[PDB]
Amino acid sequence: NKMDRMGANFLKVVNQIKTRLGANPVPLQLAIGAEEHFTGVVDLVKMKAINWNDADQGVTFEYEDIPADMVELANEWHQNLIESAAEASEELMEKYLGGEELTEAEIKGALRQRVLNNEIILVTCGSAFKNKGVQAMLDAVIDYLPSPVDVPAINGILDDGKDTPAERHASDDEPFSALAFKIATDPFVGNLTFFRVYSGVVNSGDTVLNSVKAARERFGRIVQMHANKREEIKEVRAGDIAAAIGLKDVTTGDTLCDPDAPIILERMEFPEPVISIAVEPKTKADQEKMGLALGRLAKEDPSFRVWTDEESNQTIIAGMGELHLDIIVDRMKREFNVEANVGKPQVAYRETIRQKVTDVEGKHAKQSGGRGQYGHVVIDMYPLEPGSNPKGYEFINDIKGGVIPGEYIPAVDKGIQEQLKAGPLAGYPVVDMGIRLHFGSYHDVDSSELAFKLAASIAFKEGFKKAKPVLLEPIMKVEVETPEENTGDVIGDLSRRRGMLKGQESEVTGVKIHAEVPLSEMFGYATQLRSLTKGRASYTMEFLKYDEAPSNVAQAVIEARGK
C-alpha cells in the first residue's frame, strides 16, 4: 500500500521483505508509475496492464495494453514468477524445460498450493487512497489464499492429546466445533462473543457445551457483523465467522462444541503487559463502580490485567504501552462513565538487620496490686543475609533462665511474628529476620502470653531500631533483548537509571541482555525502552532482590505514621 507517495518504490520493498523477514516474496504485480505517474498495475500471470479510472471511480478497470516503458522488466519478473511457480512440483518443471510456458490456471493452482504449504508470500501493489490496486488485490485474495477446506484439516483433540483425537473439518454434517476467539464489551446485553465455526452447524438458541470452561452454554442470538451493526441471522455454519450473544461462562480462546468433545484446541497463549499505573475515581465511594468496569475490561482483554494490590489499597492495572492504557482510561470514562485520575504505583520497601546480634531486654509486669499475671523475655537480634532462609522467618530457642510456661514458648515466637509483620521501621514486613531468646521470669501459675507478647513488642521495637536494620527498596531482575543498533543506548539509559547489569549473549536476531533495576524507577520504563530502539526490543521485568540506596524518598510512610 501507499505506492502513490513520494520516494515510493516497489522492487525495493520486495527486496526488503526478501532480505529482512526471511521469506520469499514473488511479484504478482508490477507497478506502472512510482509517485504520481502511478496509473495502474501490470501483472505477471494475466500479462496485461490495468489502468484504473479517476478519483473514487476506480471501480472500473479499463484493461489496457502493457506500455513498452516497462515491457522488459515485466517480462523479467514474469519469467521469474514462472520458474518460481514451477518450483512447486515436478510435472510443472519438465513441461517448462521443454521450451513451453505454463498457463494461467496451472501457475495459479501451483502458487496457491505453495501458499497453502506456507512456502511463499505473494506481493500485490496499489494505493488505497488514490483508489488504485484494491480490486487487483482482491483478485489475489481469490486466486491464491486458501479456502477453509483448502487449509489442512483442523487439529482437534479429545480430553487427552494424540496425533488425531478429533479429526474435524468444515462440513454441514460435521459436529459443531468452533473457537471463541474474541469477546467484546456491550453495555446492552453484557458481552458479545465472536467465534469462528471450524466445523459443523449451530443455530440460534441451540445448546453448546463449553468444552474448556467445563459448562454448557447457549446462543441467545447469533449475529454476523457489518463492522458494528449486528446483523440478526438464524444459524452459522462451517467457515463462517459469527458473534454469539448472551453466552455467559465463555472467555477468549475457549472452545465451543457439541457433546462429542473436540474439547482441546491447541492455543492458550497471550503476552505479558509491560506498563503499569494506578487509578482513582472522582471519590473513593465509587470504588466498586470502578472495579466493576475494570472486571468487564479484564474479562474482555487478555493482556490487560486489573491488578488489585494488597500492600496498598490502590487498584493498579497493566497494559502493553502508554497508548493502550490511554484508550482503556478514556474507554473507561467513555463507555463506563467513571473518570479515573491516575498516578504511579507505590513502592515496596522492606526491613532487615545487617549481620550483628544485639542484646536487649524489655521489662514490665502487671499484678503489684492483685491484677492479672505478666510476661518478660530477653531477646538478641541476629539477622541472616538477604535470601538465607527461604521461609522469611527462622528461629532457634535458648530459654534457660526464668523458663516461660510450657505452653507459652511457641506463642513467644508467634508473638514476635506480629512484630515481624509490623516492621517497626516504617510498617514493612521484616524479611529473613531471626530472633534468639534467652531469659525471662515465670511461676507455676497462669501467666499471660499477651503480656509476654507486649513485653516482646517493646523488646522488638527497641532492639531492632538499635541493631540498625536496613531500609531496602525493590530491585527487579530485568531481561531485555534488542537489536545491535541501540544496545549501547538502552544500556546507557539503564545505567542513568540505576544500572546494575547481568550480561551479554548474541542471539540469532539480537542480543541477550539482563540487568537489575529498581521498581521505584521501572514504572514508565516501557515507552522509553521502545523509543530508544524503535520498538524492536523484547523484555520482561521480574524480581531478584531487595536492596538499599541513598534516597530521601525513604520517609513517606514514616511521615504518614510511625517514627
Binding site: 549501547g488 544500556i491 550480561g503 551479554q504 549473549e505 548474541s506
Partner: protein, 141 residues
Amino acid sequence: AKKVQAYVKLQVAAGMANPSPPVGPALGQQGVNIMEFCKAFNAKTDSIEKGLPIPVVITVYADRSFTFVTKTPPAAVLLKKAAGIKSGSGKPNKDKVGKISRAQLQEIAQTKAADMTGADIEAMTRSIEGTARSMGLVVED
C-alpha cells in the same frame, strides 16, 4: 578473524567459565553462545587460574570456530596466589601492597612464559615482575 576485538572487558573470575552473570550487561552485541561457552577454558586453563584474578578472553577464530594463540596463567594471579597477600590497588599507601619477591618474579616468568613473551623470557620476567611489584609494594625476600 583476529585476536580479541570483542573487548567488552567483563566476566567472572576463572572460577566459573566466563560467567556472563558476573560479566554484567554493559556489553553490546558480541557473540558468546553455546558453541564456545565452555570450549577451551575448562579444558586447558586448569593450570592457569580457578577463582582468582583473571582478565577474560574475547577471542574468536577465522573458520566459525573459537581458537587463538593461548597463553599461560595471569601474572597478577600467580604472584598473588603464591604471595598470599591480596593487596595492590585500593590500599596502596599505608599498608603492604602485596608480596613481590625476586624468585617470585622468576617463578612468575616460569609460570606465565608459555606464549606470553616479551623481548625474551627474561623480558616477560620483567613483565610479571612489574606485575607483582607495581601493585604498590613488595616483600623482602
